[PDB]
């Protein structure tokens, strides 16, 4: 087959630009972003992924500038990263070389669903939990992901591995300083974004994270609408009616805007009857109209839902003990260290 | 089977309520605030749509205030409302009977497009020109619609009669007054909404008209995208980067967020060839950063594109005349009456 050599920057680590070789390429993604190829690394015959995105000259990738900070096993790791010309002449591409993951929670969820079953309780505890642990760490550094969503979460079936990708709409959000309000995709777009608030918070991820648990134990969206007022009737009719307090905390501009008296729904009759009361009282906790009173992605991981994670016993339906969960870092624990006690369960030292 | 009575209010003309009987109630809508129902009026045998929502001592309903003044060929008429009962006690229902139209643009659109064809130029003609005739009508009035979209023109196949429905976000906008930038669905977005702005025109109907437009030729949404992000992407790739001026026509709180510096690509290379030349000029002066560069609706409906209805020997596809497209009022060409010179041609008005 054609094999491709290039001289790759290593991701993390000292600027020693290497020769790398690969071969087996093929497109596995085309967005706004750019092109998702698959290849295989000659060396090691190791799958990669490689993210093909135009280069102005005017500054550097922001992308690529949080992607060389980031190291965690929940995140999808950048490899290398090269230049190159591809399709236009005169124009340059820069080419991220990350981990490859073979599904998303996109499609194994709508697995489930064209087969009416539910993702068993375990692997929702599973990939609930890492991805807080994602979100935990990139918050540490100040950096919001701003696009949580099913399909920016993939997973090793075997491994029962999930990890974080996409961090094209990743900022550093810094107090004071105003940020777009047009990120986060419909369904999981956090109240204060659908009032198009520019002082929001790293809480918007939560909100997201939220959506994506609720959409796991539903087997659909919790907040659906093609319209910013048709999702925020979703919310309206499972939260109740936000008060003029719970509208200054969101956006103070849509105070004097009269909204439709609905009652606060009990959450135990918003899922089925078996739905288990942690998953219920998460949901709750993390799907709030205040940004602040919302559980922290720490706050989240160390939840009463979690528990079976931390039991000594616990195993992976084809056998396999449970992958990483316990390894946390002084930079992860940082936004609350006590939590370690809860989190970093006796049997996990070793 | 089952015959319901009820003592209707006519929507147009003096308060002088009279008996309505209708039959065979079918549930035909499922929607933000209520249902959507079709029924036989016992005494024509005729078919109505009866929207039900449930409503407040508090206000008076907007929508219901906004049907009760209307009355053009291109818009669904409010027959009746009359009041009633639904749920657990202590609710009021509000009930529109309003004309029944039994095909939307969506439904027809999506036919061509699984049989991997495009709707004929006459269809594209006739359907456009008719949404502007109903945007010239309710905007000489102030009312922005607010959710122009597919979904929301309805067809009657065999008349080739489009009418304009779902008058819910419907609002009167008032020079000064804010309104809430979270109207208007996923890929029919003016981006001034997407920008967040609180301070729009009417011209974000043209907006979305443009979009249904260039939707109706290509056999594909012209901006999609999940996220407003992605659909801005979509925009720029098309119409070029907006300029820091065009940034401050629309939203001047993004003039200072820089933009990708991607070429003002030609809208000839946009369609397919056989496109016609004026279709895609009709896009172009729709589909324009500048909100106030917009055509209007009655300038639209005066456009090149629209010369073929305006020929003596037009005819449908089944060989009948085209609907009504010439009876214009004094209200409807009150924005600008010197157009009426285009609009009317010699034929009509011997
Ligand atoms: C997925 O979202 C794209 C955003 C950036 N992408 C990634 O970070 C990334 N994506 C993938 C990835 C791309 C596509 C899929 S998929 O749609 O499930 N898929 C399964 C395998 N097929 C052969 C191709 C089709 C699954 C994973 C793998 N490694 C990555 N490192
Ligand atoms: C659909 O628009 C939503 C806004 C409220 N609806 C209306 O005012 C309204 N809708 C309809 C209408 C509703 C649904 C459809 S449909 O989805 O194409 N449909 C075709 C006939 N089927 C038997 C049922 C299914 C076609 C027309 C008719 N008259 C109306 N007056």
């Given at each position: ?73 929940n ?50 505890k599973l990939?609930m939990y890492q991805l807080f642990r994602?979100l935990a760490y990139?918050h540490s ?65 939560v ?69 288990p009361?942690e998953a219920?009282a998460l949901?709750?906790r993390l ?8 559980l922290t992605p720490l706050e989240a991981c160390a939840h009463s839902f979690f528990d079976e994670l931390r039991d000594p016993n616990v ?7 449970t992958?990483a969960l316990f390894n946390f870092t002084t930079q992860e624990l940082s936004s609350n260290p006590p939590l370690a006690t809860i989190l970093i369960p006796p049997h996990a030292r070793?």
């Amino acid at each position: 087959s054609k094999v491709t050599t290039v001289v790759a920057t290593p991701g993390q680590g000292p600027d020693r630009p290497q020769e790398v070789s690969y071969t087996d390429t093929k497109v596995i993604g085309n967005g706004s972003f750019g092109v998702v190829y698959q290849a295989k690394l000659c060396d090691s015959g190791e799958l990669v992924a490689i993210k093909k995105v135009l280069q102005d000259k005017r500054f550097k990738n922001r992308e690529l500038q949080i992607m060389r900070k980031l190291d965690h096993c929940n995140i999808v790791r950048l490899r290398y990263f090269f230049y190159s010309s591809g399709e236009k002449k005169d124009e340059v591409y820069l080419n991220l070389v990350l981990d490859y993951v073979p599904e998303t929670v996109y499609r194994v969820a709508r697995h489930y669903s064209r087969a009416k079953q539910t993702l068993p309780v375990i692997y929702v505890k599973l990939y609930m939990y890492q991805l807080f642990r994602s979100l935990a760490y990139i918050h540490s550094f100040g950096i919001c992901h701003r696009d949580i969503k099913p399909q920016n979460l993939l997973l090793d079936p075997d491994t029962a591995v999930l990890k974080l990708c996409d961090f094209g709409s990743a900022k550093q959000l810094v107090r004071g300083e105003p940020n777009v309000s047009y990120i986060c995709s419909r369904y999981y777009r956090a109240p204060e974004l659908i009032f198009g608030a520019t002082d929001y918070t790293s809480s918007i991820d939560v909100w997201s994270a939220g959506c994506v648990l609720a959409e796991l134990l539903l087997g659909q969206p919790i907040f659906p609408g093609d319209s910013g007022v048709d999702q925020l009737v979703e919310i309206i009719k499972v939260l109740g009616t936000p008060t003029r307090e719970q509208i200054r905390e969101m956006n103070p501009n849509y105070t004097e805007f009269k909204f439709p008296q609905i009652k606060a729904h009990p959450w135990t009759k918003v899922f089925r009857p078996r739905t288990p009361p942690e998953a219920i009282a998460l949901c709750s906790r993390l799907l709030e109209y205040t940004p602040t009173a919302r559980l922290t992605p720490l706050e989240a991981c160390a939840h009463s839902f979690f528990d079976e994670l931390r039991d000594p016993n616990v195993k992976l339906p084809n056998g396999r003990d449970t992958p990483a969960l316990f390894n946390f870092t002084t930079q992860e624990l940082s936004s609350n260290p006590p939590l370690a006690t809860i989190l970093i369960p006796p049997h996990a030292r070793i």
